[PDB]
């Protein structure tokens, strides 16, 4: 499997181009498996033009200037008001994998979120991290034992949030998948005690098959008490699915169609997020995701009740092209696209973002 | 005339990509009897874009486990949510005709409508079905003889329930069939007794034109004093015309715009059918068609007021490609493909389907 | 200049067709003269966009056979609600020219709108019209003289309504004609006596530049009282002017936008339909055009509040393929057409058609 | 460094102005033709500003007693052939030879009134050449040190500018991506100045530019009704709606979409200019009916300058008077106050209708 290796920055000029870019250099199953997502696609086009909807105002004579992109969240002092999303597999896009990834992420200077389907260990991770705040992403075993090792083993790796996705009982009708019969080229070291033997060779449908089905909120309450800590409950779109959360023990909602990979036919995740952040009413902090491409994006995103974003396939775009440093040109870009709409609409910090009027768009995409 | 004649299961990724498969292999008058609409086809389009009007919400902790497809329809217990349509003619998309199709639905566990335009005998369908529960769907004669003689043919042959398909009074302006110059090139035996002669070499329009046009209600209470069996209402879009049917004594309301192959202009079905829904208004059994396309719109019809859907144009398709097995191919697809879809859903069972909250996207396929 | 000759019946599909293939046998600069429309014809495209913001509904069970598409306008007794509408210069698309479509329209039975731009002669269309009625459409000279000897020649000649087109008081600005320098091939003889010359090698622009720009509404109260005639009053979109026409004595209202080839960036004539009628409320008649096509359209036009539509564009495509025969053809056609139509929405008669449910469509055309 | 932008003089026949962007790609150097034909991230906001015309419908109205409508105004004082005057814009070399000063001429022959560019690759002598006498408002970008601010100003009001244009919706550019992927490094000087140009503009320096130029001052760039409050009660003269014609925030609104809230708040305390997206004169209509009193012009002008120096300009500002000539005869508008009371269609289906 014949994945990239070359380490360099690049120039971004914008998100969309990486994905044309990184076609190019990375091998067609893996590259379409991450590139692709449920049926003809359309709710990922929604994921995409939901931004539309919600359109931000220049502001003028506002007494800005340096806008200041820095937050905290879960006391994590972070450059930017953004995360890395779990991601599974970096080593579909480049070998150094998922430690590429955690070294970008880390030197740019915010919180990586690893994947319970890593391509990587743990080990091989933490030295790419070299002490940077992670936290942990579940998919569950039925075994209960199973998960109290998993949660206590991604403790002492320094992990200070768990993160369950709960989206993903079943798998996604990834066509661009299934026309591939794309299966992993490695294994996943961290949850085949479950697979029992190699993930190598699996499609993701019975991964996602030998993971648990059944999840109910008690889970939630049981990860929280085992692991002692902070708990998001990952791919949330309806609110009632935020009270559910809250009301069982999670210390923050995490807002997210999965990057349109899961369920099909579905709202772009944006449209989803105002009435959820309603719902939550600042119980707990909002981290959201799917389709987040630039820096007007996190903005909005923040404006509508979010207090960070989780991005994803821009960076794994940035990794395939230049690694570690590729990556971190991704991250860079979207600090700096950031703090440009800042200064425009007159946000000296991430607290006004927050607090912005958004203009409504009826019409939508075609206008 | 060259139909298909290979039988196979066949791979179904999705269902529209079965549209261009079979043009491969039917030929050219046959293919454009089945897949085009009328005028322009505009309304055959907004059959497939109401889906976007309406989208699913993922729930999660939902404590779900391997979903339970079946439901219950006036007394037959069917495997999935759905019935096979009346369609006529499927000697047009393969050389086993109504037989084929009969066997896989059959086979499957779900209702085989008949056409009263099939291209076979009743005895021809009946080796097809080997015992599975068959509804009959007539197209009036004029002379009343004449409609208790098929109407008692058809129950004869085992018929539990009548279809009385009333928005065909005179043809659509299918554009296609008229420049393709179509005609049936095979007779129907169920109604030959009216036209002039056999119906091979007519068009579908004086096949039409021999039948009832002027039908009121009265026609509904004959069918039902006669046949002594439930009479559902076919091709209802208008909420008066479901009270209207139920008075009359229709014991299921059935809507349906034929697949845009009538009316012109007028809406895709899915964007009339909670409107009927409210006027029923659990008085009697609804059945949804007229686009159904994924296990999508199998749950979004259930949750909008439809108790089964009805399939057409997808599983013809697979009977060209494939005979009994490439239409039996199709059927399991479409429980497959509800079984993701209720799993994500946090539906148990297809009564949870009927729960379901749906979300509004006023801005349409564009997005 | 070139004008087909050819005289025959023509199949007629769709009347959408006929467009491209009278361009095949039309000199481009008359054939473009005849399809094009102000500006990039956005305003052409809602005419025809618009009849998707109000659909229609099937109805069964309606006791509906052979349905009548006769009715009665100002004491007119004709075969359809449609009257041919008023064009210049129908020597561009046939050599036979006005007497053709004068022939086609007496033998169909219905009315022939003379245009004052015609480039036949009074005495050469009433010899095609042998007797049929006709209503005389008025350009306005500038001098009041000249408007009382044009409507004593359109009296004596047997016309029994006059038509003020008031919406050209300047040209439209048509894109395609000017591109082309587009002009006029043929005199005009009826309004000769007010341009400085012949028609021949004038733009429209200097023709409409010749004609009356200030019309108030005395110009309506002055043709009623010098004609006694019942006046129609024509290009009307604002209900306002419905109002003001009626106060200034007109005896009828005809809503239209010129087939878009006036006022550019305006909406589709029937959008403004149901605004006007409600003002109008039944204190006279309502001729309705701007964009029909379909038997449909002129279903919802009755539905929307006109008693009648005029047609355009497609009679004299019909005209270039046949002369007065393809002209007819095309009437025939709409004839059929709206039969079908009423046949399956449940309308018996004229009157039933006037009183159709409409559904709504938000998403309008891409749905 | 070198750039060869065309120089021929000539009169064009204007059938539309759409139809000037690309006939101008064949005769403008390909990097500068993209910095004036461009906009931010992928145009969507330029797409927007364009499209926003089919929100609002013009009604055509009948027997409405008019004839040779007149399309002359007054706006501060200055009478004018038309509601709509030449928007400031930089590098009008980049189009043609005789860059400001050709516009400069086109402007003054017609009319109306020329906006003067800090940003200007020609003097105030060479403009005013061209100007021969005609009005000049002067726009800013300010600089950091005040007494630059000051000297621009004086200098301004020198030259003979009559009105202060402050543009403060660029107080970072906007992310132009054809500028970047052309790796476009603009050609020539800027004589009026001389970047670190000041970010941090508050409310203060409203008041500070009319208290120094003793000037009527135009805020620049609004698009949220509050800034039209806020600059008002700093002592602004004026409001001029504009999004910069896209080439600023992304995947904010079609400019025209954002007027009536404006107009509303202003309530005609002081006059309005709107821009971003003006082709048609149906859009100078409908710009006036929804509360501007007038409208700016930039690309097609640029356009038509690049095509035939100051002759192709006037050709473009004559377009406009004879286009929105006609729209007023259709509509019933005898003269420009009417427009502003011109009833409106609304149309929420949007440009696909
Ligand atoms: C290739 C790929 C792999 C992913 N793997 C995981 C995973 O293992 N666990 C998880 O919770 N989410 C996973 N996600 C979802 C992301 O966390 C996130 O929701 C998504 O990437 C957001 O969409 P965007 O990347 O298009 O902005 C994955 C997404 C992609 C594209
Ligand atoms: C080729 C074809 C033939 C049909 N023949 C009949 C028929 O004989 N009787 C009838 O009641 N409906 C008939 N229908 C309508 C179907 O019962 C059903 O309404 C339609 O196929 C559903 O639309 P879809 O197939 O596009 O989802 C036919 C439909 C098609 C496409
Ligand atoms: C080529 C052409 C010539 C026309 N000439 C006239 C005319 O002389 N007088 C008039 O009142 N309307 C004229 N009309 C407008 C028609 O009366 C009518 O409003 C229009 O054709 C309806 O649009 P449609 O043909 O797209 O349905 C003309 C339209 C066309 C297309
Ligand atoms: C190439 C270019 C340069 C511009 N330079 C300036 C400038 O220096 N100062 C300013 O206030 N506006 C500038 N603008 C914005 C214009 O004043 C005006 O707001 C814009 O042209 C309106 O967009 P439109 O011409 O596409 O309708 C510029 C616009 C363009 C396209």
């Given at each position: 499997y014949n994945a990239p290796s070359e380490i360099k920055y690049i120039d971004v000029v914008?998100?969309?181009?990486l994905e044309e870019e990184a076609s190019k250099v990375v091998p067609h199953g893996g590259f379409n498996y991450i590139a692709g997502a449920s049926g003809d696609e359309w709710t990922k086009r929604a994921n995409d033009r939901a931004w539309k909807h919600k359109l931000l105002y220049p502001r003028l004579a506002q007494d800005v200037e340096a806008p200041d992109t820095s937050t905290e969240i879960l006391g994590h002092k972070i450059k930017a008001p953004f995360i890395m999303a779990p991601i599974a597999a970096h080593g579909l896009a480049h070998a150094t994998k998922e430690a590429g990834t955690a070294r970008a992420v880390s030197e740019f200077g915010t919180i990586m979120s690893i994947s319970a389907?890593?391509?990587?260990?743990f080990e091989e991770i933490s030295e790419g991290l070299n002490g940077g705040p992670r936290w942990f992403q579940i998919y569950m075993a039925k075994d209960d034992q199973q998960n109290r090792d998993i949660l206590d083993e991604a403790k002492g790796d320094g992990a200070t949030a768990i993160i369950l996705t709960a989206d993903s009982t079943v798998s996604g009708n990834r066509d661009r998948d299934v026309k591939n019969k794309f299966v992993y080229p490695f294994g996943m070291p961290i949850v085949q005690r479950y697979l029992r033997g190699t993930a190598e060779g699996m499609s993701l449908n019975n991964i996602f098959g030998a993971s648990k089905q059944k999840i109910s909120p008690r889970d939630i309450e049981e990860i929280a008490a085992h692991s002692g800590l902070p708990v998001f409950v990952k791919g949330i779109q309806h609110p009632e699915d935020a009270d559910m959360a809250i009301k069982a023990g999670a210390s923050g909602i995490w807002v997210s169609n999965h990057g349109a990979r899961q369920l099909y036919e579905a709202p772009g995740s944006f449209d989803t997020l105002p009435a959820i952040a309603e719902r939550v009413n600042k119980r707990v902090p909002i981290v959201f995701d799917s389709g987040v491409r630039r820096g007007e994006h996190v903005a909005k995103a923040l404006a509508s009740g979010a207090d960070v974003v989780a991005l994803g396939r821009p960076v794994l775009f940035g990794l395939a092209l230049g690694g570690w440093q590729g990556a971190y040109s991704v991250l860079d870009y979207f600090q700096k696209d950031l703090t440009r709409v800042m200064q425009l609409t007159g946000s000296q910090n991430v607290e006004d973002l927050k607090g912005l009027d958004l203009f409504d768009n009826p019409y939508g995409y075609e206008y």
């Open positions: 914008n998100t969309y181009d389907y890593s391509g990587a260990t």
